[PDB]
């Protein structure tokens, strides 16, 4: 359950990054999605997830997301991704 959950989290993160390209009403729905994923992470408790996410999305997006997370950093990677999503949801508008 967990591994496909991280797959869908990364896939919908890339999709929401694609949807918020015009925001550089979707901010409120994005904040609801981030709060939903944060609640799911509260209920439960990235390079190796390449194949599942790229089966879901045949576009490489993936190299942008990994570069943004590695610029951010420079059980724990999940926390880093959720802090990244909340930080983007703060500056959405």
């Amino acid at each position, epitope marked *: 359950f967990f591994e496909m959950w991280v797959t869908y989290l990364l896939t919908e993160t890339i999709t929401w990054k694609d949807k918020l390209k015009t925001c550089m009403k979707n901010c409120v729905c994005f904040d609801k999605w981030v709060k939903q994923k944060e609640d799911e992470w509260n209920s439960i408790k990235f390079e190796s997830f390449f194949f599942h996410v*790229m089966k879901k999305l045949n576009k*490489e997006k993936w190299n942008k997301l990994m570069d943004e997370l590695r610029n951010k950093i420079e059980q724990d990677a999940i926390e880093l991704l959720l802090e990244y999503l909340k930080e983007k949801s703060t500056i959405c508008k």
Partner: antibody, heavy 119, light 110 residues
Framework: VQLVQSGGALVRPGGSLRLSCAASGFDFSDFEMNWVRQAPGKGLEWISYISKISAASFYADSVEGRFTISRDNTKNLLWLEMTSLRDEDTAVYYC??????????????WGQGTLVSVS | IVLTQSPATLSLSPGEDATLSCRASQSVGSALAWYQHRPGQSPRLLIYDASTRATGIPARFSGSGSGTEFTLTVSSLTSEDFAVYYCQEYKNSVPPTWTFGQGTKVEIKR
């Protein structure tokens, strides 16, 4: 469709070597690349993978930190920069092409082979 | 995932059918491939989903298996079918693994 490698070379232990794998007959940007290693009398053993772009690069557990796979999808060359070569890396290095589909992680078409021997 | 080629060396006459095996330590699925390392030549892909057939491969190369037991059945052994056959899992787990078998071998019996 053809994958032509660089040919074997003799290298001292602790040294460096740059393999090459020039592909022809297809689109290099549309295919994931692989490196497969065969020691004498040991069998086949995957060591490296690179994606269509350099977004993903995977290594075997015995080769992490030492080897580096890189590709040039406008010159159709796949490299494997080799660093800190031990005595167990005397082997034949094969350059493999992966099928379309990121789930189907197989090795479709292979190179000519490259006997790397250390002394 | 640990892959075991039980047949190993196989003394068989040419023109006959040869069955093989590739036992996985874990439940993989249909994510298993088969290879043929002919002597003096590069390996080639035969089957890539433990049941299918790769492009450029004759119909005598057939396989089966969807759990932990896998089997490649090659029929009417020609001169180039006496090779070393490998089986590779590509299971969609995290981290991804590319694990071969030891290599079963088909040889001419006398």
């Amino acid at each position: 469709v053809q994958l032509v490698q660089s040919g074997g070379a003799l290298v001292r232990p602790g040294g460096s070597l740059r393999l090459s794998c020039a592909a022809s007959g297809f689109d290099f940007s549309d295919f994931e690349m692989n490196w497969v290693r065969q020691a004498p009398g040991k069998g086949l053993e995957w060591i490296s993978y690179i994606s269509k772009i350099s977004a993903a690069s995977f290594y075997a557990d015995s080769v992490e930190g030492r080897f580096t796979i890189s590709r040039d999808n406008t010159k159709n060359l796949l490299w494997l920069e080799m660093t800190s070569l031990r005595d167990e890396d005397t082997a034949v290095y094969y350059c493999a092409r992966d099928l379309p589909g990121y789930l189907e992680r197989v090795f479709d078409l292979w190179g000519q082979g490259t006997l790397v021997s250390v002394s | 995932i640990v892959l075991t080629q039980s047949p190993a060396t196989l003394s068989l006459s040419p023109g006959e059918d040869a069955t093989l095996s590739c036992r996985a330590s874990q439940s993989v699925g249909s994510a298993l491939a088969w290879y043929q390392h002919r002597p003096g030549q590069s390996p080639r892909l035969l089957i890539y989903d433990a049941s299918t057939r790769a492009t450029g491969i004759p119909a005598r190369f057939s396989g089966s298996g969807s759990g932990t037991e896998f089997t490649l059945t090659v029929s009417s052994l020609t001169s180039e079918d006496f090779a070393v056959y490998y089986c590779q899992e590509y299971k969609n787990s995290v981290p991804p693994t590319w694990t071969f078998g030891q290599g079963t071998k088909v040889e001419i019996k006398r």
